[PDB]
Amino acid sequence: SMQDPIADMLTRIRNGQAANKAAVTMPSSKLKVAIANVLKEEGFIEDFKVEGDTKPELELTLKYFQGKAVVESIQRVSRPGLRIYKRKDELPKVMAGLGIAVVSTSKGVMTDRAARQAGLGGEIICYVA
Amino acid sequence: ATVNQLVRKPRARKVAKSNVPALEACPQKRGVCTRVYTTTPKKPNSALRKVCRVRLTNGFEVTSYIGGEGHNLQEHSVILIRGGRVKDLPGVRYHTVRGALDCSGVKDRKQARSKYGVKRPK
RNA sequence: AAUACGUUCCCGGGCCUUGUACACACCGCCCGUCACACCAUGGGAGUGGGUUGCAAAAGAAGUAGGUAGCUUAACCUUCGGGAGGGCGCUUACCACUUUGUGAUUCAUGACUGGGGUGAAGUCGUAACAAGGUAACCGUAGGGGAACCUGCGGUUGGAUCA
RNA sequence: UUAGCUAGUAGGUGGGGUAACGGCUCACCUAGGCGACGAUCCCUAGCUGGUCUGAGAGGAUGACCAGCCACACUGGAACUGAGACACGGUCCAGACUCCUACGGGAGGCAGCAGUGGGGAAUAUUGCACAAUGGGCGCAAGCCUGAUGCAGCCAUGCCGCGUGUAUGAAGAAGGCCUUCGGGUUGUAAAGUACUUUCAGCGGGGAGGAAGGGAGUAAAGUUAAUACCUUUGCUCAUUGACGUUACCCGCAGAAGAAGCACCGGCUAACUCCGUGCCAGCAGCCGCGGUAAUACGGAGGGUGCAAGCGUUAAUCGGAAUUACUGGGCGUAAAGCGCACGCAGGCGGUUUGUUAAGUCAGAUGUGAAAUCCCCGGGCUCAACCUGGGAACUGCAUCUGAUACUGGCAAGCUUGAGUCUCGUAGAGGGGGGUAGAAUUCCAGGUGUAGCGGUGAAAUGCGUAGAGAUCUGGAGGAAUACCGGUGGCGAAGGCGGCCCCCUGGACGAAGACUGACGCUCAGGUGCGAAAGCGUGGGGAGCAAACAGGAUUAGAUACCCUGGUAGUCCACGCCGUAAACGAUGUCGACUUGGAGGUUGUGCCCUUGAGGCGUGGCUUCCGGAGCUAACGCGUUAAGUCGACCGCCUGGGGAGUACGGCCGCAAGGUUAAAACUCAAAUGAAUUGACGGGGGCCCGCACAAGCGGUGGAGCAUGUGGUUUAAUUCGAUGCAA
RNA sequence: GGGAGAAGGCACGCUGAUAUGUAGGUGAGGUCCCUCGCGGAUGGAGCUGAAAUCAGUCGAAGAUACCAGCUGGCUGCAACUGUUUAUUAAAAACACAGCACUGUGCAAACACGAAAGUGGACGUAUACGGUGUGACGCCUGCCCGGUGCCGGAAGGUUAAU
Ligand SMILES: [Mg+2]
Ligand SMILES: [Mg+2]
Ligand SMILES: [Mg+2]
Ligand SMILES: [Mg+2]
Ligand SMILES: [Mg+2]
Ligand SMILES: [Mg+2]
Ligand SMILES: [Mg+2]
Ligand SMILES: [Mg+2]
Ligand SMILES: [Mg+2]
Ligand SMILES: [Mg+2]
Ligand SMILES: [Mg+2]
Ligand SMILES: [Mg+2]
Ligand SMILES: [Mg+2]
Ligand SMILES: [Mg+2]
Ligand SMILES: [Mg+2]
Ligand SMILES: [Mg+2]
Ligand SMILES: [Mg+2]
Ligand SMILES: [Mg+2]
Ligand SMILES: [Mg+2]
Ligand SMILES: [Mg+2]
Ligand SMILES: [Mg+2]
Ligand SMILES: [Mg+2]
Ligand SMILES: [Mg+2]
Ligand SMILES: [Mg+2]
Ligand SMILES: [Mg+2]
Ligand SMILES: [Mg+2]
Ligand SMILES: [Mg+2]
Ligand SMILES: [Mg+2]
Ligand SMILES: [Mg+2]
Ligand SMILES: [Mg+2]
Ligand SMILES: [Mg+2]
Ligand SMILES: [Mg+2]
Ligand SMILES: [Mg+2]
Ligand SMILES: [Mg+2]
Ligand SMILES: [Mg+2]
Ligand SMILES: [Mg+2]
Ligand SMILES: [Mg+2]
Ligand SMILES: [Mg+2]
Ligand SMILES: [Mg+2]
Ligand SMILES: [Mg+2]
Ligand SMILES: [Mg+2]
Ligand SMILES: [Mg+2]
Ligand SMILES: [Mg+2]
Ligand SMILES: [Mg+2]
Ligand SMILES: [Mg+2]
Ligand SMILES: [Mg+2]
Ligand SMILES: [Mg+2]
Ligand SMILES: [Mg+2]
Ligand SMILES: [Mg+2]
Ligand SMILES: [Mg+2]
Ligand SMILES: [Mg+2]
Ligand SMILES: [Mg+2]
Ligand SMILES: [Mg+2]
Ligand SMILES: [Mg+2]
Ligand SMILES: [Mg+2]
Ligand SMILES: [Mg+2]
Ligand SMILES: [Mg+2]
Ligand SMILES: [Mg+2]
Ligand SMILES: [Mg+2]
Ligand SMILES: [Mg+2]
Ligand SMILES: [Mg+2]
Ligand SMILES: [Mg+2]
Ligand SMILES: [Mg+2]
Ligand SMILES: [Mg+2]
Ligand SMILES: [Mg+2]
Ligand SMILES: [Mg+2]
Ligand SMILES: [Mg+2]
Ligand SMILES: [Mg+2]
Ligand SMILES: [Mg+2]
Ligand SMILES: [Mg+2]
Ligand SMILES: [Mg+2]
Ligand SMILES: [Mg+2]
Ligand SMILES: [Mg+2]
Ligand SMILES: [Mg+2]
Ligand SMILES: [Mg+2]
Ligand SMILES: [Mg+2]
Ligand SMILES: [Mg+2]
Ligand SMILES: [Mg+2]
Ligand SMILES: [Mg+2]
Ligand SMILES: [Mg+2]
Ligand SMILES: [Mg+2]
Ligand SMILES: [Mg+2]
Ligand SMILES: [Mg+2]
Ligand SMILES: [Mg+2]
Ligand SMILES: [Mg+2]
Ligand SMILES: [Mg+2]
Ligand SMILES: [Mg+2]
Ligand SMILES: [Mg+2]
Ligand SMILES: [Mg+2]
Ligand SMILES: [Mg+2]
């Protein structure tokens, strides 16, 4: 069924960008709030917004540049069938520095560049290229 | 080919057999020629290639092609076979080491002499 | 001179379309028994080796347990011997060896089931076009062999004026 | 293609034993333990640090070096000893070899050399304890086939040499040539300069620190004896050794080969061959101009080596974790249920197992790598460092995952009310038609194909009207319509019954998804038992067509089809598309609800479910699929690794049986394949023509002759053309 | 289900101990109830009594005598247990369960009896007679010319009358 809510979120972002949507929507959660917060920080979405009292809908407003999409590629890393926990020297560096990789560390959720500047690994949720 | 399928049943490796099984991984084995006889190859060629049917040292019975231009081999004479499939004789996988131990080299050959066992001309 | 009504067929062409397992391009390639030769493979009355299981017999030396017998320098000793020892006998364990009977594996075996390769061999012509009976799948029957027919299924079949 | 194993076996209590715990060993009791996370069984194997390869993850492998284990002719057993169940010890048995006075005895190179044998293949029956270490010894010293060295071997790695410069008469000679010439070629000759290495002679380090005498000082000591420590002069101790290295001599002298030249692959021309000889790593060469075979000339590549073979890895993304694929190329179980297993919505709190981070212990040294030192350089030797991707312990952090505890309601499900349905099971019944029977009419044909015939008919058929009997299937509805998970399901009625879907509410509150093994359903054909048996119809018979026709076509016709019970478990079981779930432009219809709006007439505005066609971005090898995906993704399962051999043998399980299921190898080929393109072809279609056919006139083929040919004949019957197009 | 008692092997006497006769069987007393008697519960005396383990010992030999499987392999024939040539043949012959064909609609067919009658059967097509074959598995192929048998009564020949 809904065996991966994070891949539901990422697949919704990828589909909406490749099909030229503007305001995509998904059911909310705490990890989805944290990942969308990372994306709004680094600049792969315009702004996110979680609306709803008991069960909310998280809304993502996608960015564009000269018509083309902003997120070139986006994928899972640590899928639930096979999880990928990485130490600090064996951290990734996606797109030779250009893209970002979202890592959940002990200090919340943060981009892998901040994870290297804080000196700890974690779990790699996605490779926003 | 998911990872659960992989740990339940492993990814089976690609093993394969050696095309010269009678040599027993020895680079040259010594055979005694039982027969020496000619055979015409399989089409689209036409010649009379010379295959000497030898009994090897380890009890194996294999034919083996004779190289060079002409030869001197009879039966009752030990030779060395060295592997290497002749393409156009069906079912012959070995050459005889021309120069080795009873089968002397070609007459009056001046080039490629190491491959056929002929001393230097002066 | 005769005759031409017309395109239903006869062959040779031209154009579009469709189908193709054919490209010296249908005078194309192609399938299977049969006959001869050769190789490997299975069954094969069996036969011979290797290894091993079981149930048993077995009991050299060695240890450990016991003890009538013989014997003994170290301790006690009234000198009598006593303890203790050694040899010997014996029981326990166990190797070689022996029988019986399987299990596996290799070699070999008249003859045979099929398979593969071969020089212009014999009998066909089943498939590819609507391959001239559309093929094919399953199953059953038949038959020199491709295969044929029954029952059910598929389009991976062709024509649509 | 090994699913059961285990009787001291798993445990207990008591005794014994061991350096020590322990079924280590016994007595007794309990009846256990091991097993799909692979027990047991079979085959192979010394393991590791490493080495080779690889960018890396890995793959192969265990030579030297180092650690550990095992064994010492084969099979045992114990003693002595700290330590062995003992390489050069004891005892027993065995095979082999040898001595014997025939009674008996001896021996164990997998120590170093060496021999015989095997093998494609691997060295001297060498010198020394000078060094390091060992054994004994207070020491001196002795023993040391460890070790240090020498001999051999291009076995590898590395270094050096075979001269250097000048030199055009571009010499000769070879080879080729468009007979100008080119090429070998500054290459050789020539003249000048050097002596590395091998040879000759001389000098010669360093590996040597120690040890032995004597003396001085101190320590013990009643003692200035003895002994020990510290220095102090002496002769001293090398197998290597004719050493490393340095110096002098004379001379270009003593020192270059192997493979390849068609593409891949750097390198081309002539001559000799003529499907012969032969080459080959693959594709292919050779049949009279061979850059592919053999020779020459030239060149290219490596160089004291070059190749051929064997073996590993790479390339091979060709077993894919990093890193593949499933509509048609090999590949989605026939379909569903479902245990284990895998994964699991969302909020809070705790725990901190996984995760991460610091420290500690550790990862033997050697090797690999980074800086460095030395052998003149390199190989090699060596100092320091990280690495040693691990393991464990302590200490933290709490985002994710897990546990645990409480909650939510969207996921999943339950109730209320309908709708639609060839969904299933059982029993009735209806008509049309076919066949059979019985009776009437009435007369000579019926039936059949391409054309006929076998067959049915003068015993009165076929046609025809009435009455029966029987079995099967359900015209029109009927439509890519519905229902079911798949197979499948088709007149009507009843009985039993599953499922779906829609509406407003309510409720439980993660109860979910997938599923190895396991089970259930599973068309047709087939089998068993017993019924029925009208049509149809394998087998079979007869008739034709045919060259033959064991086929199509015709006349008959038994299994079977059918009913109840079972068994088989297979299909192109097809959408050649596993299930579940999410997101992504549209149109056309169909079907079945349902909300609203005035159903203001057979409307209109939406939301569901299901279903067929066209198509967008996307994808795809292309075809095409395209909100029901073959798009973008996630969870779990199945399956493929070239074509045959072969879904076959053997073996297992199932089956009464046919056979099903699991399922290789030996061999053999360099392809087999999928999609699309251009042709060609069709006894495919459409359109069109032509002396093609039709409509006509005349002729050949019959006869005689002219002339050409094929054959025969000959001394020669010259040679060439031989489908149309001789 | 079988094969199978497959084959093949071990223990076996007496005495002592566990236990001065064990486990088990039987149950006298005695005690309590007692619906009171040939009643029922603990109660176990006495009586009997295997079988096993350990130790000892004897013999050449422990089931010591009598009684008491010869076993295995390949194959023919017949499925088997059965029955027969009393008195030369016990089988491969006969039967057999099973299979099929055929007759028979009950006043059955069929037999024994001139006939009554009776068996069939006091049964009714899942029954009965007759015939061939002889479990079970795989199967049963072609011929209707001959001789039978069944269906026809249109025609030729055809008796008594
Ligand atoms: Mg035209
Ligand atoms: Mg055409
Ligand atoms: Mg085409
Ligand atoms: Mg072709
Ligand atoms: Mg043809
Ligand atoms: Mg055989
Ligand atoms: Mg003994
Ligand atoms: Mg054909
Ligand atoms: Mg035909
Ligand atoms: Mg056909
Ligand atoms: Mg056909
Ligand atoms: Mg076809
Ligand atoms: Mg037929
Ligand atoms: Mg104990
Ligand atoms: Mg104890
Ligand atoms: Mg690689
Ligand atoms: Mg040992
Ligand atoms: Mg020994
Ligand atoms: Mg001792
Ligand atoms: Mg002592
Ligand atoms: Mg020793
Ligand atoms: Mg020795
Ligand atoms: Mg030696
Ligand atoms: Mg030798
Ligand atoms: Mg030799
Ligand atoms: Mg020698
Ligand atoms: Mg020494
Ligand atoms: Mg000595
Ligand atoms: Mg050397
Ligand atoms: Mg010249
Ligand atoms: Mg010198
Ligand atoms: Mg010195
Ligand atoms: Mg020194
Ligand atoms: Mg060459
Ligand atoms: Mg080239
Ligand atoms: Mg060559
Ligand atoms: Mg030619
Ligand atoms: Mg030539
Ligand atoms: Mg070549
Ligand atoms: Mg690989
Ligand atoms: Mg390879
Ligand atoms: Mg692939
Ligand atoms: Mg195909
Ligand atoms: Mg396929
Ligand atoms: Mg399917
Ligand atoms: Mg399911
Ligand atoms: Mg979760
Ligand atoms: Mg923790
Ligand atoms: Mg180390
Ligand atoms: Mg240096
Ligand atoms: Mg937690
Ligand atoms: Mg609610
Ligand atoms: Mg609630
Ligand atoms: Mg299954
Ligand atoms: Mg059926
Ligand atoms: Mg049947
Ligand atoms: Mg049958
Ligand atoms: Mg029947
Ligand atoms: Mg009938
Ligand atoms: Mg199948
Ligand atoms: Mg179907
Ligand atoms: Mg279909
Ligand atoms: Mg399929
Ligand atoms: Mg893809
Ligand atoms: Mg489409
Ligand atoms: Mg998909
Ligand atoms: Mg695809
Ligand atoms: Mg099979
Ligand atoms: Mg194709
Ligand atoms: Mg005409
Ligand atoms: Mg004429
Ligand atoms: Mg004539
Ligand atoms: Mg002529
Ligand atoms: Mg001529
Ligand atoms: Mg000519
Ligand atoms: Mg006989
Ligand atoms: Mg009998
Ligand atoms: Mg009998
Ligand atoms: Mg009798
Ligand atoms: Mg008799
Ligand atoms: Mg009798
Ligand atoms: Mg008798
Ligand atoms: Mg009667
Ligand atoms: Mg009989
Ligand atoms: Mg018989
Ligand atoms: Mg018969
Ligand atoms: Mg007859
Ligand atoms: Mg007749
Ligand atoms: Mg008949
Ligand atoms: Mg009659």
Coordinates of N, CA and C (backbone and C1' of nucleotides) in Angstrom, one line a residue, chain D residues 511-529:
Chain D
rC511 P -1.0 -4.2 12.7 O5' -2.4 -5.0 12.8 C5' -3.1 -5.3 11.6 C4' -4.5 -5.9 11.8 C3' -5.3 -6.0 10.6 O3' -5.0 -7.2 9.9 C1' -6.6 -5.1 12.4
rG512 P -5.3 -7.3 8.3 O5' -4.6 -6.0 7.7 C5' -5.4 -5.1 7.0 C4' -4.6 -4.2 6.2 C3' -3.8 -4.9 5.1 O3' -4.6 -5.2 3.9 C1' -2.3 -3.5 6.3
rC513 P -4.5 -6.6 3.2 O5' -3.3 -6.5 2.2 C5' -3.2 -5.3 1.4 C4' -1.8 -5.2 0.8 C3' -1.2 -6.4 0.2 O3' -1.6 -6.7 -1.1 C1' 0.4 -5.4 1.6
rU514 P -1.8 -8.2 -1.6 O5' -0.3 -8.7 -1.7 C5' 0.6 -8.4 -2.7 C4' 2.0 -8.9 -2.4 C3' 2.2 -10.4 -2.5 O3' 2.4 -10.9 -3.8 C1' 3.2 -9.4 -0.6
rC515 P 1.9 -12.3 -4.1 O5' 2.5 -13.3 -3.1 C5' 3.8 -13.8 -3.3 C4' 4.4 -14.4 -2.1 C3' 4.1 -15.8 -1.7 O3' 4.9 -16.7 -2.5 C1' 4.1 -14.5 0.2
rA516 P 4.5 -18.3 -2.7 O5' 5.9 -19.0 -2.4 C5' 7.1 -18.4 -2.8 C4' 8.3 -19.0 -2.2 C3' 8.3 -20.5 -2.1 O3' 8.7 -21.1 -3.3 C1' 9.1 -19.5 -0.1
rG517 P 7.9 -22.5 -3.8 O5' 8.4 -23.5 -2.7 C5' 7.5 -24.5 -2.3 C4' 7.8 -25.0 -0.9 C3' 6.8 -25.9 -0.2 O3' 6.9 -27.2 -0.7 C1' 7.3 -24.2 1.3
rG518 P 5.6 -28.0 -1.3 O5' 4.4 -27.5 -0.3 C5' 4.2 -28.1 1.0 C4' 2.9 -27.7 1.7 C3' 1.6 -27.9 0.9 O3' 1.2 -29.2 1.0 C1' 1.6 -25.7 1.9
rU519 P 0.4 -29.8 -0.3 O5' -1.0 -29.0 -0.3 C5' -2.0 -29.3 0.6 C4' -3.0 -28.2 0.7 C3' -4.1 -28.1 -0.3 O3' -5.1 -29.0 -0.3 C1' -3.3 -25.9 0.1
rG520 P -5.6 -29.7 -1.6 O5' -6.7 -28.7 -2.2 C5' -7.8 -28.3 -1.4 C4' -8.5 -27.1 -2.0 C3' -8.9 -27.2 -3.5 O3' -10.1 -27.9 -3.7 C1' -7.8 -25.1 -3.0
rC521 P -10.3 -28.7 -5.1 O5' -10.6 -27.5 -6.1 C5' -11.8 -26.8 -6.2 C4' -11.7 -25.6 -7.1 C3' -11.5 -25.9 -8.6 O3' -12.7 -26.3 -9.3 C1' -10.1 -24.2 -7.9
rG522 P -12.6 -27.3 -10.5 O5' -11.5 -26.7 -11.5 C5' -11.8 -25.7 -12.4 C4' -10.6 -25.3 -13.2 C3' -9.9 -26.4 -14.1 O3' -10.6 -26.5 -15.3 C1' -8.3 -25.3 -12.9
rA523 P -11.2 -27.9 -15.8 O5' -11.8 -27.6 -17.2 C5' -12.6 -26.4 -17.4 C4' -12.6 -26.0 -18.8 C3' -12.7 -27.0 -19.9 O3' -14.1 -27.4 -20.1 C1' -11.1 -25.4 -20.5
rA524 P -14.4 -29.0 -20.1 O5' -13.6 -29.5 -21.4 C5' -14.0 -29.1 -22.7 C4' -12.9 -29.4 -23.7 C3' -12.5 -30.8 -23.9 O3' -13.4 -31.6 -24.7 C1' -10.6 -29.4 -23.8
rA525 P -13.8 -33.1 -24.3 O5' -12.5 -33.9 -24.6 C5' -12.0 -34.0 -25.9 C4' -10.6 -34.4 -26.0 C3' -10.2 -35.7 -25.4 O3' -10.6 -36.8 -26.1 C1' -8.6 -34.1 -24.8
rG526 P -11.4 -38.0 -25.5 O5' -10.4 -38.7 -24.4 C5' -9.2 -39.2 -24.9 C4' -8.3 -39.5 -23.8 C3' -8.7 -40.5 -22.7 O3' -8.7 -41.8 -23.2 C1' -7.7 -38.7 -21.7
rC527 P -9.9 -42.9 -22.8 O5' -9.6 -43.2 -21.3 C5' -8.4 -43.8 -21.0 C4' -8.2 -43.9 -19.5 C3' -9.4 -44.6 -18.8 O3' -9.4 -46.0 -18.9 C1' -8.8 -42.7 -17.6
rG528 P -10.7 -46.9 -19.0 O5' -11.2 -46.9 -17.5 C5' -10.4 -47.5 -16.5 C4' -11.0 -47.3 -15.1 C3' -12.4 -47.6 -15.0 O3' -12.6 -49.0 -14.9 C1' -12.0 -45.6 -13.9
rU529 P -13.8 -49.7 -15.6 O5' -15.1 -49.5 -14.6 C5' -15.0 -49.7 -13.3 C4' -16.2 -49.2 -12.5 C3' -17.5 -49.3 -13.3 O3' -18.0 -50.6 -13.3 C1' -17.3 -47.2 -12.2

